[PDB]
Every structure is written in structure tokens, then in C-alpha cells.
Amino acid sequence: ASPFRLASAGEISEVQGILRTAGLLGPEKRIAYLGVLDPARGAGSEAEDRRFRVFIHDVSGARPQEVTVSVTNGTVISAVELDTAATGELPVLEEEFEVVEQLLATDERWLKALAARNLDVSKVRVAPLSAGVFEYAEERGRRILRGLAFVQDFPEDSAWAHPVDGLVAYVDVVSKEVTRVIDTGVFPVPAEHGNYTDPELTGPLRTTQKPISITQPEGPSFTVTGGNHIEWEKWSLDVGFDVREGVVLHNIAFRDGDRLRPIINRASIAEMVVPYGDPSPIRSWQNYFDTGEYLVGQYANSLELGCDCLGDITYLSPVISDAFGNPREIRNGICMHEEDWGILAKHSDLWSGINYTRRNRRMVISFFTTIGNYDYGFYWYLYLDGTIEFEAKATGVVFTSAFPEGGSDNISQLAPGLGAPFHQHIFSARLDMAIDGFTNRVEEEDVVRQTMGPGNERGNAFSRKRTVLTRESEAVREADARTGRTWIISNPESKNRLNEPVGYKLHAHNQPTLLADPGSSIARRAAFATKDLWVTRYADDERYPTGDFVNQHSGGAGLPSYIAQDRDIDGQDIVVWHTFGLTHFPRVEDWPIMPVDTVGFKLRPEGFFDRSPVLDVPAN
Amino acid sequence: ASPFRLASAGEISEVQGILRTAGLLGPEKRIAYLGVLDPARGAGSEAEDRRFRVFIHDVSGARPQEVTVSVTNGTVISAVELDTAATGELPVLEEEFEVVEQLLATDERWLKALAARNLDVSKVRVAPLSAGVFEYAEERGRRILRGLAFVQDFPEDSAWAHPVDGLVAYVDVVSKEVTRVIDTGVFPVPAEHGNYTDPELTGPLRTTQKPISITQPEGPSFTVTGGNHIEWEKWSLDVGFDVREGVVLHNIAFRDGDRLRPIINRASIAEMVVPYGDPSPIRSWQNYFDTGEYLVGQYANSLELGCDCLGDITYLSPVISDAFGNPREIRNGICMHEEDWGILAKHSDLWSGINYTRRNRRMVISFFTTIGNYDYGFYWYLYLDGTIEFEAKATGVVFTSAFPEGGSDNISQLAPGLGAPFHQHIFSARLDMAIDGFTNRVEEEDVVRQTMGPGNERGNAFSRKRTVLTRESEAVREADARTGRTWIISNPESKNRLNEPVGYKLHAHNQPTLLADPGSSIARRAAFATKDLWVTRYADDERYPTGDFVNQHSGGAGLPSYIAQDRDIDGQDIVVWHTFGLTHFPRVEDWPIMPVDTVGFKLRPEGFFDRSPVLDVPAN
Numbered sequence A, B: 001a002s003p004f005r006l007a008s009a010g011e012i013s014e015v016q017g018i019l020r021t022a023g024l025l026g027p028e029k030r031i032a033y034l035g036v037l038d039p040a041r042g043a044g045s046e047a048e049d050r051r052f053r054v055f056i057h058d059v060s061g062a063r064p065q066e067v068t069v070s071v072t073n074g075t076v077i078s079a080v081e082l083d084t085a086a087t088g089e090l091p092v093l094e095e096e097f098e099v100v101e102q103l104l105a106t107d108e109r110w111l112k113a114l115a116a117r118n119l120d121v122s123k124v125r126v127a128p129l130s131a132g133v134f135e136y137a138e139e140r141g142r143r144i145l146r147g148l149a150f151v152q153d154f155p156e157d158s159a160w161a162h163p164v165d166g167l168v169a170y171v172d173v174v175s176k177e178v179t180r181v182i183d184t185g186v187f188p189v190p191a192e193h194g195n196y197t198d199p200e201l202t203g204p205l206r207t208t209q210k211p212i213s214i215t216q217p218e219g220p221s222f223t224v225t226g227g228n229h230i231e232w233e234k235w236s237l238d239v240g241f242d243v244r245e246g247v248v249l250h251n252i253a254f255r256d257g258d259r260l261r262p263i264i265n266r267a268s269i270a271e272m273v274v275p276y277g278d279p280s281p282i283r284s285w286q287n288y289f290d291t292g293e294y295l296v297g298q299y300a301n302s303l304e305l306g307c308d309c310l311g312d313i314t315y316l317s318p319v320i321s322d323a324f325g326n327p328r329e330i331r332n333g334i335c336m337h338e339e340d341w342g343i344l345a346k347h348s349d350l351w352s353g354i355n356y357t358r359r360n361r362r363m364v365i366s367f368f369t370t371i372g373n374y375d376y377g378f379y380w381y382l383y384l385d386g387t388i389e390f391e392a393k394a395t396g397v398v399f400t401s402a403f404p405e406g407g408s409d410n411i412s413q414l415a416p417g418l419g420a421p422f423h424q425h426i427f428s429a430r431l432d433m434a435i436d437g438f439t440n441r442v443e444e445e446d447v448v449r450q451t452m453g454p455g456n457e458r459g460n461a462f463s464r465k466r467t468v469l470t471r472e473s474e475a476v477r478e479a480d481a482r483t484g485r486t487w488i489i490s491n492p493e494s495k496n497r498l499n500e501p502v503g504y505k506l507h508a509h510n511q512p513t514l515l516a517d518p519g520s521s522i523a524r525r526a527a528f529a530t531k532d533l534w535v536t537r538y539a540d541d542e543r544y545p546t547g548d549f550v551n552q553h554s555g556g557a558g559l560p561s562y563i564a565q566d567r568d569i570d571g572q573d574i575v576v577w578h579t580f581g582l583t584h585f586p587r588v589e590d591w592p593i594m595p596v597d598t599v600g601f602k603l604r605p606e607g608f609f610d611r612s613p614v615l616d617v618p619a620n
Ligand SMILES: [Cu+2]
Pocket: A394, A423, A424, A425, A584
């Protein structure tokens, strides 16, 4: 049907068959990443050509390959061998995560470290984390995972309450060798448990909460058609899913009268980085690229009706590939429902005697993921008035360490002896703009304060200014909350009835960006996180702000290299990349399990419609 | 019962009697403001003294008086004469607002101005706005109102669509004279209507919205006792109401196990300024002090179930006094209910096999107000995890002007010939802090970036710094979104189990503050709006950031004067004043009736509890 429909089990199996038939997927090959490609720029030449991109890992050490297949034609479009020491390693595989603990359990220098702390190796859990790129020259070209230990006193015990500081091990997951075990010194292992399900900790459960029922007697107001095509209160779009990005939104458009007007071609969280600010050698290399290195969509939870979703929910169950190319469905991995959102508009007019009130509502498209200790909720919102919003919810268990005796400037104390290294959770929203079509431009709008004097005698006047970002060289911008800075994306050839280019304004939260030193490995690898907004000229191969292969990949790829092309963005097919994140100084209230904290952004129409789009909302 | 209970109809009647009997309530006397005083510090002699403060205006020109009466002892505790030219004028009375259109209709200059524009005087609505204090010497001591005209073509017509630019009148509401009429020139009167209820405009109402039913089969989880005492999910507070301030929250506390721990003594929106940034002499004096000059609680709406408030709602009907001392009930003027707020906390642990999720919820306490063209929703939220939040929702109809030919740097176009002057809506939340009691302190917390080098060789470290505001001359702070600036209120004599002073962190939205030139009259009269956070030593006569008599007061009246005392705030009974607002450059979608836009702030526990205060919430 629509070329934006979700990949089916059938197409996944066909990609396997096609790869096999071509000699690309033998018994030593593993699919590190498989995802469907978006229809190319230029419309549908005729029937759809469903292509799938695949990253093929070789467990015997042979160079991996990037291959694009056409499930439609049953062909292999291309297949290049990769020089990983140059362009980067493939995403870490599940089977390689499970390798770290077992290998360390028989290494004598690990065992020696545990014995020095009187720890039973059978109770030491290891958090296998991406290695990143530092001064370990022997690592270049190898697939390394670093391990941090946590004690789990019993089966239902939360190991995070018992971090083993002073110890870290590096493991080559292909050759299956422990390359290094570093023991900086012993630290007491925090003794208090963080078992949030233990009645001794929780105490008697509250009997005070009365139920709140959210029903929809006639069902929801949105329609799901062709599997993933949604239509709700004038909004139109396709809900896609990628194992790396999670939920992706395609063809976001609004039905303004008789015209379906495009707003956003593609919207996704293209990268997610979690950098740690503890300078201890045990953790100073700690930086997760949850989207790039781990593939967040892969870890999506199965949303259950009642627990994760209240009201009339419509679930989608995306299909992804396992490491062998077989289809694996994520049951109820995508949650869809509409919710009441208070008052939309209101006015009691004295002169006319007319009292008016209208209710607001938003369409919610979300999914939840679990990456080790953290759990993240990704929410896209569509509002009656044309506003588009994204919200990320961070929860789970805080990553722990020992709390230093003499206190710390980079770690906070959660319990006695228990510490929590400072860190950030920074996201990158890739917004492939289509404001009334692809001819778009971006302007940075700052509030302008005026001096009291001629033409402003009472000194009360204030204005606003807009600077067009013409070339990619000048499209890397920072926030300025003080002057109310925003960025408007307009179509300089689609004007409203008042003869002004139609547009949408981006409202950022103005949270701190990447804090690490500019010369740091993380500043280079996650250069996108150092600025709030980037604008590029669309290019089908520029998909992630960090590049295609983030795992153990140095700088040299991603936004900084795309931008260097210095293309024309003034009234062109453009893409907006917005950096937004949380700076977390853990607090006692975050222990033993953290309450949801949130971050996001939104876009509101700015002269897009000829008047309010909600004049037709029923009184109801 | 409680000394915090809402004023009774009987107490208002009693204040009236007491005033009458003391000869304070003569034929020419009007009650411009009446409100119950809250119990003073201590309350030792558990002896109630229900006092009421009143501002009495004299219609015949005599000096007004501030009177405090005791309803419990039927006494007139105080009665002072006010030198308004010195201390500012009393709030504007309802009867004086009406008077403006009437007196102008029989004025020759006025009628002459209308005749030149061919406007039928009986169709010309006049907006009576505060005068403020400008170059008009003959205004000092006099109660002046300024009128801007809007044509109302028919009874049910929205006059806002037809501003009459180039014209403005000044009126002495006491001597009832039109002191001046200014006609700077004729401007076409926008002809298009903005009747959002008219089917020619709305078009056929949409039939796509399905109902969303929010019920509570067992009633809500909160209990209202003593008329206004709320107990909900460990929270405890008293919902007060003031004609000037609106909903006021008293004794906000949290039951941490055995102790009911105080957090905030008194929370209220102490002022609301709406400055316009159009340098046109027709409007360059326009600044509404919605709380100070017009009294927000006075124009509260009766919240209609299903329309304004959806779900299981509990209403409170506060009682105010009319201009003659008679009690007037604001039926359903306060809306109360609890609502689902998505996920509170969640974690799927691989090592333990325990999957955990909890639903969050918030207690909503709100009221809605209409001030001429705008409508504002004031919401206070209490969350399960101890977070307190306030949110202001702005709707209504934008104040209009003519859009000048050639455009404008200070006005935007909403329709053909219809302009919308740029303006801000800036609020002042007065937070009388009581973190575990009155001994409080405030620190400004900035994120701290570190340079790569010794002790931070990988350049990944980042810390935070806190500066304690010791004296009031150091307690006037500005935002810095870039360094993640927040402000923490702690009790230095109350430590949590990790031995750190308990606290609450204030998270501002960091919107722009007052834009007017520093030397402007508005900058002086609304100096509070020029900075984000103010901390002052508590004093029972320091209630408003603009002072007690904002109407036509010259400048520097409140916050700047209080702060001038330079008292000790390091570990004292303190009050935090947070300035926050919207900077509005109206857009085409704000016309004919604007969709809700919002601002707010929130405070989160910062090491207040010894661990997560929500471990006892059930799974449900
Ligand atoms: Cu965090």
C-alpha cells in the first residue's frame, strides 16, 4: 500500500532470503542493524520500491558490510565492506553484552579484585557499556565493551545499590579476551538495599488513592488506516518505527479546509547521548549513545493496558530483525491514544454578552525503552491548534558509584556510602521540514529592546528581529533565553492571506547543552550536543548527527562534516537538528528508583493559518 | 474553626455594620477593597482575632481611608487618611469604569472625532484603562481613566475587531470631566468581524470529536474539611481567596511519615502586569496592573462543569464585598480535582526480573478570571512526588489597534487593517517560604564547567556551585538558562539523613523579563518585573511587589523599597518573589479568539526527603 507502511515480518524474512541467496548472510553473519529506507526524493516513479539497509557483522572477525537490498525486486542494490577503524564499528549486539560477565568471571585479575573486596563472583553483575574512543591504541579496529561491577545479594535484589568502585575491566567481545582489568583501590560497597518492592522499604502501601476512569464510549476520534496511517482532528501522518530511532513520524500534515498542507516531512530523535561528568578513571570514559551505539528501538518495552497506558489505547506492534535476520515483533511497543488537555480558548465578553469556552485535546504517540538502569519514554503530541510537541521522560534507577569519604564535586550522595555521578541526557531531534512543501528557510528571532528617546519618548517600545540563515556555515546556533530566542521555519513562497510567508516557530526549553570540555573525546564524538540548533540541506545519506557508525568512532563524521559543505538553505529542502537535554545532579529523592523528569520542545504555527484553526471546534 | 477559613458572608456583613456604625460608611463612601488579614506570627494566645482590611473611597473628592476592623470584637482597630498623591490611588471601582463611555458620549471633542470617522456614537464601546503616571501634572491627586474606542456593530458583535485608532480620551472619574481628547489622525477602522460564534466564520462545526469520560466511581482522593482545608496524598493546605490576589494557598505541608512538614507558608500571585510596547502616543501609557489596579479575584468566573472543569470536581464559592460592603458570592469561583499525570516512576530490571511501573497524579486548584478582553486561568498543582507547580493560561481576545500602512516594528497584523500591539503578561508569585519551618536561606545554583587538564584529563568533568544570598542587597537575581541557574530554599537547621540541609529547588522557565527601557515609568512602577527572583525578609506589611496602592503611584513603591532595607536573609523568615511572563507578538492564529498560551514555574524537593517519598504508592 503506502510506501510508509511499517516493515512486516514478511519483508524481514525476504531480506534474509535475499541476503542468503546473495551469499551475504552465512552462519557467521549477524545483522547488527536492519531498517527500511524512506521513499527517495522525487515521488513515486511507479510502484513502491521497498528498500532495506543492513549492517552485517562477522563473528569470525572478517570486515563487516553495509548492504541495501530491494525486497521488491529481490535484489541487492549495493554491499560495501567497511573499514571500521576508519569509519566506525557497528552497533553493539545483544550476544556481545552477555559475553562480558561470563568472561570476567574466569579471569584471574578480575577474581583477584573481587577477592580483595570479599565479593562472591557469582553475585557480581557487570554492566557492559560501550567503550568509546580514548588512549587505548590496541582498541582501534576491535569491538570493546567496558565493564562495571554491581553486587546482587539475591535474585530479586537491585544490584545498582551496590556498586563496586575502584574497578573496571575492558573486554574484546569478538576474540572474547579480557584486555584489561584496572583496580584503582578498594571502596566500601554500599550496604543498604534499594529494593523498592520490599515492604520493609516501601512500608504499608497507601490506601488513599481513589480510581480515575478515562473512557471513550464511542471509541477514539482518530483512525488508524493502512496499518500506521493516522488521521485525527485535521492532522494526517504515518507512524513509522526503526530499531535505531524508535517511533519516527512521516508526512505530518494539516487539513486546512480543502488543502492537506504539509508541515514536517520526517520527525525523529536521531541521537541520544548520556555523558558522565565524574573524572574518576573508573567512569570518565562513560558515554552512552543510546540511539547510535545501542539502538533504542531494539529495547522498546511491551506497553500494557493500564500500567503504561490509561484510556482508550490503540497499540501498534512493530517488527524488527533479530541477529539472524528473522522477524521479531515488539508487541504493543507503540501506544496511541488521544487525551483531554484543559481549555483551548475562552472569553466572557461584557459588551456582547457572549460567554465562550472550548476544550483542548492532544493525540499522543509514544513508546518506552529500557537501556540497562534507565528507562526513557518518548512522546510526540499533536494539538487541535496546530502545535507539535515532543517530550522525553527519564526514569529508572540512577547509575551508582561509591560516595567518596571527603565528599565530591562530581558525585552526589544518595544513601550512606552510595554515590551518583553527575551526567546529562542530551537528545537530537531531526526535523526534516516541509512547511507547505519543501522550499523552506530558517530565521532566528530575538526580542529587541529599544532605547527611550526620539520615536520612543516614554521608553516602552520593544520589537523583534529575524535573521535568515542562508548558508550551512551560519546555521549552527545557540540558545538565548534572555532575548527570547526562537527559530522560525517558513516557506518564502507560500504566503498567508496577509501576504506573509507561512511558518512554524520552534520553542526550545533552553536547557544547558554539552558541558564537557571542547577538546574532549565526547565533545568531538557528540559535537551536535554542543549547540542548540543546526540547519542542513537535505541529503539522503545525512541521517544521524553523529554519523552511521557511532560505536568506537572518533570525530570526523556527523553534523560538523555535513555543515562544512556550506550548502544553500535559504528556500531549499532543509532539515532542522535540535539539541535538548537534562543535566542531572542526582538527589536523594531519585533513590531507590527515580521519579520521572522531563525535557522537550514544541513548534507552534506562526502565520501558517489565515486565522485560528480551531473556530470549528464544537461547544460540546 | 481554622483562622485560615474563607471569609464568611456574615463576616462581610459584620464589617459593613462596624464601618457604618463608626460613621466610616457614608453615602459617598465606596469599598474599593476589602479582605481578611491572616493571623500574625506566633499565634501563642490561641485566641482568634478575625481582622479585615479595607480601602474606602470617597466619591465627592474627600480623602480615602485605610481601615482595619476586628470582626471578632466588632471594633475599628484602625482608620487612616490616605494622601493619594503621596502614596498612590486606590484600586479603580467598577462604577468608575462604566462612567467613561457615558461621559464621552456627550463630549463635543469626542463626538467630533467620531463624526469625522462616521461612527455612530451609540455603537462606540469604550475601554476604560488605568492612566499610570506620565507628564500630565494636573493628574496628581486626581483619579484619571483613559478610554480607547472599539466599534460594536450590533449587540452580539465583538468590538475588538474594530479599534478606532488615532483617538484617546482622559477622564477624571471623580469630577466626572473629560479632561482631554486626543485625535492624532484618522485611521481606517478594521471592517472584518471576529465573531467566533458566527457560522459564516466558524463554518460547519466539526463532528469528529468523540467523548472522553473522566470519572471517579468512588469519589476523589482529597478531603475538604473546615470549608477550605485540603488533605490529599500526604499534602496538607488551606485554600484561601482574596478579591485582589485570587486563590491563595496557606500552610502548604507534606506528611513525611510521622511529621507533617511545612514547605511554604503562603503562596500567591501577588501582581500581574501587562505592558504594551507600541510607542504610539495613543497607547504608549497602556500598562494594566491586573492585580494591583483592577483586582483579579473580583472578576472571577463561575466554573461550569463540563466546560471549564472536567471530571469529579469540587467547587468552592468564595465571598467578596461589593462597593457598599454587602457580601457577594462568586459561585464555583474555585475549581478542585485530581488528575492522572502519566508515569510517575518505572524500571524493567534485567538482573532481578522485576518489572515496575507507578502512575503519577496531580491535585489541581484553580480559578478563572476575565479582565476586559483577556481571560486567564490560574492553576496550582501538587504532585505525588512533592513537586509544587503553578501555571498561568492566557486566552481571551487580543487588544487591537489599526495596522499602519507600511507596517510596524511594534504591532503585528491579524486581519486586513487590523493590528495587535506587542505586549507582555508578567506575573509575580509571592512565596512566603517555610521549608521545615521559618529558618530559611536561599542559594543560587549554577552549573559549573571544568577545563580539561590535571584532575580532569579527559575533560569530561562538570560540577555545580551554590551562592547563599545573605543580605537583601544581594537578593535581586537574574536568570541564566545557559548555566542551568536555579534557586534553592533550604533550612540550614534541618538536615536530612545524609546530614545535608533539607531544601526545595525553584525551576524557572526563563522567559524574558520586562523589556521597557530601564528609565521608563513602567520600569519604575513595575520594577519587580525587571528581574527574575527576589528574596526579602518577611514583614507583614510587605504584601505586594508593587505596593498597596499601585493606581497612579509614581514609582519604586514595593520590592525596590523593601530590598532597600538590606535585612538579613541568611537563615531567617523569608519570602521569595519570582517574576515570570509571556512576551506576546500576536500572530494570525491568535485572531479572532486566541488559543491558550502558558507560563509558570515549579519547585522540586532537593534533599528534603530521605529517599523517594513515593515508594508507598500502590501498583493499582
Ligand atoms: Cu539522569
